Design an enzyme around this catalytic site. Structure first.
Site, mmCIF file in Angstrom:
data_model
loop_
_atom_site.group_PDB
_atom_site.id
_atom_site.type_symbol
_atom_site.label_atom_id
_atom_site.label_comp_id
_atom_site.label_asym_id
_atom_site.label_seq_id
_atom_site.Cartn_x
_atom_site.Cartn_y
_atom_site.Cartn_z
ATOM 1 N N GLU A 145 12.137 -30.417 8.490
ATOM 2 C CA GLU A 145 11.102 -29.674 9.099
ATOM 3 C C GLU A 145 10.841 -30.298 10.539
ATOM 4 O OE1 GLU A 145 7.765 -29.392 6.717
ATOM 5 O OE2 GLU A 145 6.546 -27.463 8.105
ATOM 6 N N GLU B 22 -2.048 -23.645 10.179
ATOM 7 C CA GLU B 22 -2.275 -24.344 8.535
ATOM 8 C C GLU B 22 -3.657 -24.176 8.624
ATOM 9 O OE1 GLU B 22 0.438 -27.586 8.953
ATOM 10 O OE2 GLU B 22 1.178 -26.728 6.848
HETATM 11 O O1 LIG Z 1 1.476 -30.352 1.862
HETATM 12 C C1 LIG Z 1 2.219 -30.122 2.889
HETATM 13 C C2 LIG Z 1 1.420 -30.303 4.190
HETATM 14 O O2 LIG Z 1 0.840 -31.638 4.166
HETATM 15 C C3 LIG Z 1 -0.299 -31.779 5.010
HETATM 16 O O3 LIG Z 1 -0.640 -33.126 5.004
HETATM 17 C C4 LIG Z 1 -1.480 -33.439 3.853
HETATM 18 C C5 LIG Z 1 -0.501 -34.279 3.157
HETATM 19 O O4 LIG Z 1 -0.050 -33.535 2.214
HETATM 20 C C6 LIG Z 1 -1.539 -35.226 2.250
HETATM 21 O O5 LIG Z 1 -0.644 -36.201 1.572
HETATM 22 C C7 LIG Z 1 -2.355 -36.138 3.015
HETATM 23 O O6 LIG Z 1 -3.125 -36.805 2.088
HETATM 24 O O7 LIG Z 1 -3.205 -34.963 3.600
HETATM 25 C C8 LIG Z 1 -2.681 -34.466 4.548
HETATM 26 C C9 LIG Z 1 -3.850 -33.469 5.305
HETATM 27 O O8 LIG Z 1 -4.680 -34.357 5.859
HETATM 28 C C10 LIG Z 1 0.372 -31.453 6.625
HETATM 29 O O9 LIG Z 1 -0.934 -31.551 7.442
HETATM 30 C C11 LIG Z 1 0.988 -30.234 6.615
HETATM 31 O O10 LIG Z 1 1.594 -29.857 7.604
HETATM 32 C C12 LIG Z 1 1.866 -29.786 5.292
HETATM 33 O O11 LIG Z 1 2.300 -28.580 5.448
#
Ligand SMILES: OC[C@H]1O[C@@H](O[C@H]2[C@H](O)[C@@H](O)[C@H](O)O[C@@H]2CO)[C@H](O)[C@@H](O)[C@@H]1O
Length: 224
Positions: free
Chosen positions: A120, A205
């Site tokens: 990605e 998102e």
């Molecule tokens: O789940 C996919 C999504 O993840 C997003 O980041 C998250 C991450 O999954 C998590 O581990 C972390 O603790 O939090 C972040 C968000 O702050 C990511 O921003 C997306 O682009 C992605 O689709």
């Protein structure tokens, strides 16, 4: 609006583009909903918007409504010369957990479903509410007339490269996404000669907050 796509996975396509009310994470929300609107298809581009409010699970994406450039399967990234695109957008507020981002998936299997891939590539144009991309900070990179903080990590088995603005947002943007792929091919060993393009999208998102409204004043995308 020409079309209102308020159903879960409400969908439109036309003029080689598509639009999806892509509420893929909504079951993690404790309340809220979202609708995606087709506002126009003027001048070789798409004009669209999305309104939403979500609560619950602040690290979980609830949705990524997007406009996508439709593409034919089986095109190796190394065999795509250019992916020229521009976008103009606004958010009516920034006290939300949300981004604006391009999203590209590639996979060695050319028939891989559109929900993911082997790799990605994201290009973030906004980063609101203290959210993080997948992974960890890697390095800074000069592309598309800007400096980016590149983050890398894994979502399942999928390797994710996210290019972030060091400060502020970018509400009017144009680039050639092949510049980003070429950088990954050179310096990160990204296997462009065996990876096929799966999706080519821009959207937002949405994690928590609202009522909020994203307006895409214009989106255009091509590839050669
Ligand atoms: O789940 C996919 C999504 O993840 C997003 O980041 C998250 C991450 O999954 C998590 O581990 C972390 O603790 O939090 C972040 C968000 O702050 C990511 O921003 C997306 O682009 C992605 O689709």
């Amino acid at each position: 609006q020409i079309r209102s796509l308020c159903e879960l996975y409400g969908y439109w396509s036309g003029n080689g583009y598509e639009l999806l009310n892509n509420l893929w994470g909504k079951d993690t929300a404790t309340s809220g909903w979202q609708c995606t609107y087709l506002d126009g298809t003027n001048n070789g581009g798409i004009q669209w918007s999305t309104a939403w409010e979500w609560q619950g699970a602040p690290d979980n994406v609830k949705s990524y409504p997007y406009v996508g450039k439709q593409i034919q399967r089986g095109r190796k990234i190394s065999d795509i010369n250019s992916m020229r695109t521009s976008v103009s957008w606004t958010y009516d507020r920034t006290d939300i957990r949300a981004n604006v981002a391009y999203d590209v998936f590639t996979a060695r299997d050319p028939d891989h479903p559109n929900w993911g891939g082997d790799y990605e590539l994201m290009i973030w144009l906004a980063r609101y509410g203290g959210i993080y991309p997948i992974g960890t900070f890697h390095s800074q990179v000069n592309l598309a007339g800007r400096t980016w903080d590149l983050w890398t990590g894994y979502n399942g088995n999928m390797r994710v490269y996210s290019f972030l603005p060091p400060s502020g947002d970018i509400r009017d943007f144009s680039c050639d996404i092949k510049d980003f792929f070429n950088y990954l091919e050179r310096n990160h060993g990204y296997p462009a000669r065996e990876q096929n393009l799966i999706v080519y999208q821009v959207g937002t998102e949405c994690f928590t907050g609202g009522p909020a409204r994203f307006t895409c004043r214009d989106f255009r995308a091509d590839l050669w």
